[PDB]
Amino acid sequence: METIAKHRHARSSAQKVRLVADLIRGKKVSQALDILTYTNKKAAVLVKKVLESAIANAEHNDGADIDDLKVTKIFVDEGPSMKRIMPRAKGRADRILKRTSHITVVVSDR
Amino acid sequence: MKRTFQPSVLKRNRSHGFRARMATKNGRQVLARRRAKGRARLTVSK
Amino acid sequence: AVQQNKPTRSKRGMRRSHDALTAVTSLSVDKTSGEKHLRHHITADGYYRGRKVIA
Amino acid sequence: AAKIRRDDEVIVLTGKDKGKRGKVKNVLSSGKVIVEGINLVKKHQKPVPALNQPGGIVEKEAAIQVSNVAIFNAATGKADRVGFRFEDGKKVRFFKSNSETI
RNA sequence: CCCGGCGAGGGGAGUGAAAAAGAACCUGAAACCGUGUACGUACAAGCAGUGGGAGCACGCUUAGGCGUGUGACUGCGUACC
RNA sequence: CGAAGGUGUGCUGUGAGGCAUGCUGGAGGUAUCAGAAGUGCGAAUGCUGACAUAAGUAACGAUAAAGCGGGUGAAAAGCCCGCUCGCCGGAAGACCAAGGGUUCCUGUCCAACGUUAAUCGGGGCAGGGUGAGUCGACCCCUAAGGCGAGGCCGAAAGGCGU
Known part of the structure; x- marks a missing residue:
């Protein structure tokens, strides 16, 4: 038997969460x-x-x-990104991405 | 540094208001154009 | 100064090959309460080396 | 005028309840009717402290298209169609199978 | 009903022909990002393919073969408009 | 008893291509022979949307500065209370006009906004708050200037003036 659990639209980057996910696999x-x-x-x-x-x-x-x-x-896995505007010098504007992720865990007795 | 926009309500109304537009033949043409386009706000007057 | 060609996913992985985290080797057990803790640190209930220190 | 009216006896022509009989409870302006004991659904009802009502799974009737029912003729035991005619000074409905006033 | 902050998010039960039709809801292409399996790679120099070619894994088998994936070593070879 | 569309496999023609069938999909398609065109894209520092690289790198906005104890809370370097320290003081204090328009006080929430956390906020939601004979505006009077009955002048539109 396998059992699943999920967290969707989590506020963090997938690259940053994978570092911790790699510590507990198996x-x-x-x-x-x-x-x-x-x-x-x-x-x-x-x-x-x-x-x-x-x-x-x-x-x-x-x-x-x-x-x-x-x-x-x-x-x-990666999720949607929110888009924001950040001003810089001499009247020029940049774009900011706010990244999110989905997290999935599966436990089993075998 | 001082910038170009320095507000004043009396000056705004004396320059671009409804009665100023009505006082002249070209102002009435501005009003007719804006009515024909169908704008929600016709002049600057409240 | 900026790049003349776009780097590859292979090179991204090669550079990242030194970024993995390290886990704690082992935990210690107090001799009076039986709790697990970081070595040379007090427990979550207030013991260190068998003696209660914080109430 | 309307061929199907409240407090009539009808038989069902299409759907999962094809063949059953019942009475018309009320008529809606979109072209649908509520017939007694027909077209039942199970609703998951949330509780509300106000009005002193608890929740639960309830069974209730859902509306059905009017063109999916027919008026029942007890003399023949069959479904029928309706027509209109003037008799004394008033309009009336009549069955088309045997030209009998309803 | 259960985990969680009387959250966000999720697992069951139930509705329906269908819930990877669940409200960010018909179908669900590509760029781009991951998890698992087979084979190659830590003495080796360049448009990254083409001709030749061991070894390993796997499915048939008329036990004679063949198919499919990877590809050590070696001849030739400086993108497109 | 499974249409178009999406995704694999096998066969076939000199080529642009064609045919059959497994999975997905859930209601449309079109032979043959003729007719008409918004009829075929890799380039134009082409146009619109989505997503990479540099990279978990630069930076987080005056070098006036913080330490500790208690409270609440799922969680406190930043919120509330207390003791100590530091900075301005012709201002970094108090108040009018202009400009803005609910940002004001009380309760409740932490998704988004706040360059970090937030139990906190000029953020979300609901309720409350502006009381005049003497303060101002309106009112009586005129400056620079504006409009101007009749009037003078100008192809029209209009210009100047009692």
Whole structure:
């Protein structure tokens, strides 16, 4: 059995979230939670919330056991960008992109 | 540095207002043109 | 000064090959409360090396 | 004038309820009617503290196109069409199968 | 019903012919960005292909073959308007 | 009992091309022979939209400056309370006219806005607040200048004036 959890339209760059996603790919859930608790990054909080949601879904909707779960898949994709205007010198204007991402976590007992 | 726009309501109304436009034959032509185009605001007067 | 040709995704990856993060090797266990903590740091309940320090 | 009116007895010509009978409850201005016990749907209703009403899954009737029903003739046991004629000084409806006033 | 800040976002249950028809809603191309598998690459010099050609993985098999992916080594070779 | 369109595979002609079929899609297509054209794109420092590179690089707007304790909160270097420190003081204090128009006070929220976080705001939503015989405007009087009954002048339109 595989169980999914997602966070869509998250306020961060995919490049920045992938750095933290790469630390927990293929680990046991307890080990992964310990790793996330001691990473001084903002993406760690978001990733940790998603992992906790996935574990709760596996317990409640599928009758799973916590001690047998592993992080079988994790990935981050790009989302829409918001466009803004920032003035510069001598009356010239630039464009600013505000990037977002989607985060997906899959836990399994096999 | 001093710039080009220095506001004043009395001067605005004496220069571009409805009665000033009505006082002359060319001002009436401005008003007819703007009515024919269908503008929502016809002069600068409130 | 600016580029004359556009760099490639291969070169982007090669430059980024030094950007990976490092994880903490291991955690320590207090001898009285049993909690896990960073080595040489106090725990989240206020213990260090078996003694309560902060109430 | 209108061929189908409130408080009539009709039979259903098309749809999932094809063949059933019922009464007309009210007539809407878009060309649809509400017939009793026909075209039921299950609505997911949210609760509201005001009015002292709880939520739940309710069953209720939904409107059906008027041209999908017919007026029922008890003498023959069949669906029929309607026509109009003047009798004393007034307009009336009549069945087309046997020319009988409704 | 459940996780979460009485959030944003999500997993089930239920509606419907259909929910990768869920309101950022018919179909859903390309540039551009990722996760997984097979093979190549850390003594090697240039328009990046073309002719020759081992080895490895995989599907048939009339057990004789063939097909499909990758491509060490070697001849020739300075884009388009 | 699956149309156009999208995406793979097999065969076929000297070429522009053609035919058959698996998956996606959910209602339209068109033989043969003739007729008519907004009939075929890689370039024009072409036109409109979407997305890359440089790069997680430069920068975050006066070098007047901060430290600690308690509170609230999912979370506090920046919000509230307290003690200490520093800066201006013919201003970086208090008040009128012009210009603007609800930015004013109270409750509640943190998506977007604020070059960072925000429990905070001149941000979102709802409710409240401007009381005159003596302060101003309106009113009586004229300056520079403007308009101007009759009048003079000018192809028309118009110009100057009692």
